[PDB]
């Protein structure tokens, strides 16, 4: 029954592809040709953060657009005050190898994780006066690549065991598991309504899950290599994926398509971090060429280059109010651009 | 122009920077290593020996100091077979200790392939490899005794002969050392096929219970630090 099952699975895949082609009436470039280009955007390094020891591997902006948490391979989780460059907290880590960090929307907790298989949630608003490990989650069998906060009690995490997990922090157990990916899940982005989230893995596929149901609704495959970053459009009906080849592709949820791709013949290295502006007109992508590129998310034209890092940009985030974009590379430095 | 709260916050930031610099001194002084190998190869034995003599957890860190210098050996466990993604975390380590079991010739070939993945990696182009040809008493016994001809797996063994090299000082059967060096020949050929900056392989013929492994690691790390000094200090 294996052969007939494979044949009918291929038939279903062909039907899905045919429906996708039949829904592709026009290209986003043709529709966007009528509107004016955004022009050159010359962002400058307003602030630099130079307190870390080793390569910075992740960062996350707060809801207040004031504090940002940064994770480095030395075992340090530093919370920076962007306006004044001061350091609020310097949390040591039990495991030095950290690949992701998340800042809770309420600001009370901060998440970290990496090769230690454990998502460590730290409490910053303790009445006891010090930052302590609020809880350690140890249900994964692979390196944690991205953890994101839904609320103060629920977290969503992606690991290298080709699975994602929704945890209840108080109980400490996996409330829900997502086991559709066939490769290492490296990125994770939550929708603004916190009901769906897209996970990008190394199988050149980005999968849209449902938090409250547990199954997978859409699977977008348009890349020919790994996927390292993924980020929702502010609308929530689209997202952008950065890949190990120099292509950033924008997918739409409603049509289940590949709206348009951003690639240049002069860029060869892969993309590490992808984020959008508040409007969604600008897409900032960090590269291994030691610099970041801003693309016009509707015209697929490179609107500018950050070009302020001496090593590969690993993390890149945009504040909720759209005030600034913070980029961190494998140098000890984290730079804020405006 | 700063207020009382702002000045106190700046003072707290300076205090944080003090501990950050204190930790930076140790981190720069500390020497970081990565231990890689298959389940067949003797890897838990080596870490157990160096811990005695000096769950689903992922990373295991082993402090061990020799000649008053510390080594932070990192073992990656509870991870999938595909290592091409988390290995990017180890561009700053001093060396990669690759342990290969020389007794089992059936799985030896794929081990070489794994070595290639470590050597021909776009991220470990500067990272040197300290290769450990482990489980040699088993090799010794395997080759001295009959019925496990090397030629059954590698056709080039018949056409290979021992060179004018350093035979071990104690008594060693010439065919045993011939096979023992032939195994090293493939690894060094892979190492020298594509060489980059500070990218050299240090092969050591070792045993799991041998107590000199820490000394070999210390010597190889001394050579690697020598090379990175010659590069960092303006000499090359």
């Amino acid at each position, epitope marked *: 029954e294996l052969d007939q099952l494979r044949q009918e699975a291929e038939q279903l895949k062909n039907q899905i592809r045919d429906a996708r082609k039949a829904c592709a009436d026009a290209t986003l470039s043709q529709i966007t040709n009528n509107i004016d280009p955004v022009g050159r955007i010359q962002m400058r390094t307003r602030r630099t953060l130079r307190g870390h020891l080793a390569k910075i591997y992740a960062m996350h902006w707060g809801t207040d657009s*004031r*504090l940002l948490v940064s994770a480095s391979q030395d075992g340090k989780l530093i919370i920076w*005050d962007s306006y*004044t460059t*001061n350091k*609020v*907290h310097a949390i040591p880590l039990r495991s030095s190898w950290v690949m992701t960090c998340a800042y809770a929307p309420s*600001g009370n907790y901060v998440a970290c994780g990496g090769l230690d298989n454990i998502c460590s949630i730290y409490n910053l*608003k303790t*009445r*006891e*006066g*010090n930052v302590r490990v609020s809880r350690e989650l140890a249900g994964h069998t692979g390196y944690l690549s991205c953890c994101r906060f839904l609320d103060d009690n629920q977290i969503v995490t992606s690991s290298g065991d080709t699975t994602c997990a929704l945890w209840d922090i108080e109980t400490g157990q996996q409330t829900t598991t997502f086991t559709g990916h066939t490769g290492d899940v490296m990125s994770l982005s939550l929708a603004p309504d916190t009901r769906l989230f897209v996970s990008g893995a190394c199988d050149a596929s980005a999968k849209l899950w449902d938090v409250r149901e547990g199954m997978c609704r859409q699977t977008f495959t348009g890349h020919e290599s790994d996927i390292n970053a993924i980020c929702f459009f502010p609308n929530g009906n689209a997202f952008a994926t950065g890949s190990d080849d120099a292509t950033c592709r924008l997918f739409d949820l409603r049509a289940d398509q590949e709206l348009m791709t951003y690639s240049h013949d002069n860029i060869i290295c892969g993309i590490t971090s992808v984020s959008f502006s508040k409007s969604g007109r600008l897409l900032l992508a960090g590269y291994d060429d030691f610099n970041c590129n801003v693309w016009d998310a509707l015209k697929a034209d490179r609107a500018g280059v950050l070009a302020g890092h001496d090593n590969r940009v690993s993390c890149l985030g945009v504040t909720d109010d759209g005030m600034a974009v913070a980029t961190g590379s494998w140098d000890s430095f984290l730079k804020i651009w405006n | *122009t700063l*207020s*009382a*709260e*702002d*000045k*106190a*916050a700046v*003072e*707290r930031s*300076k*205090m944080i920077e003090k501990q950050l610099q204190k930790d930076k001194q140790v981190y720069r002084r500390t020497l970081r290593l990565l231990l890689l190998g298959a389940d067949n190869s003797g890897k838990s034995t080596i870490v157990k020996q160096m811990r005695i003599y000096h769950k689903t957890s992922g990373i295991f860190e082993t402090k061990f100091q020799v000649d008053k210098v510390n080594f932070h050996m990192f073992d990656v466990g509870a991870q999938r077979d595909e290592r091409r993604k988390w290995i990017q975390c180890f561009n700053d380590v001093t060396a990669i200790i690759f342990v290969v079991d020389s007794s089992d010739y059936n799985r030896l070939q794929e081990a070489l392939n794994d070595f290639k993945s470590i050597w021909n990696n776009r991220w470990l182009r500067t990272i040197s490899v300290i290769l450990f040809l482990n489980k040699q008493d088993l090799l010794a016994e395997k080759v001295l005794a009959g019925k496990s001809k090397i030629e059954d797996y590698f056709p080039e063994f018949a056409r290979y002969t021992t060179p004018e090299d350093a035979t071990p000082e104690p008594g060693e059967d010439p065919r045993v050392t011939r096979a023992k060096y032939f195994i090293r020949k493939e690894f060094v050929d892979i190492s020298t096929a594509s060489g980059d900056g500070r990218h050299i392989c240090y092969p050591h013929f070792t045993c799991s219970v041998d107590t000199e492994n820490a000394r070999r690691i210390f010597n190889d790390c001394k050579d690697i630090i020598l090379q990175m000094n010659l590069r960092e200090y303006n000499l090359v």
Partner: single-chain antibody
Amino acid sequence: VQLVESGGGLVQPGGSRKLSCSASGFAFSSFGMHWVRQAPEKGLEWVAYISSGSGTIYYADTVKGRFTISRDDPKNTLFLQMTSLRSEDTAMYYCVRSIYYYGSSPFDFWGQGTTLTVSDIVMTQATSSVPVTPGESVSISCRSSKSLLHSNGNTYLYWFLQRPGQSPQLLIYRMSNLASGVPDRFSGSGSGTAFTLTISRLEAEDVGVYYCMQHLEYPLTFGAGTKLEL
């Protein structure tokens, strides 16, 4: 968190003493500390402040020079050398805990305090006593001689409630932020040189004396203190 002071008693004038405050539970090394003295028939008054790391030691203008003060982080104990005792120092001395960062809440915990008996910016409260009935909202307002709106964007006034026979407890910090562990009914508002605190649906166990502070620049002068009774 516990923060208990000791070293009180009858003192002959012109003598010396050591007030020792012991901390238990919280990170003393990461927290700054303050001393506040309250006369039997008067309000609060700032005495001294020690920053984390002992890199910033500030004293009150009215008493500068005649106190020594230090901290012992390994012993988690803060020492205050009382020197040149005067009759104006006849007051209960309270220990205050404060950490300073973005979003922090300084002046959280106040110790029980020890009585000691021997043989600038000014803020004033319009009313020193308001007769109120439980269940009715009450407004306590105080004014300052200087505007507390710093250029950063937040006003540094703090509100404290002292119940009869109890240590003062923080209610509102920075004129708009509600302290931890206090009922949501309290609120604070106002603008330059005029701040007010509103207690909606007044309940039991909230009567006492209310003070409003300043933190733009040392010294941190207190208010007269509005007394609220049933």
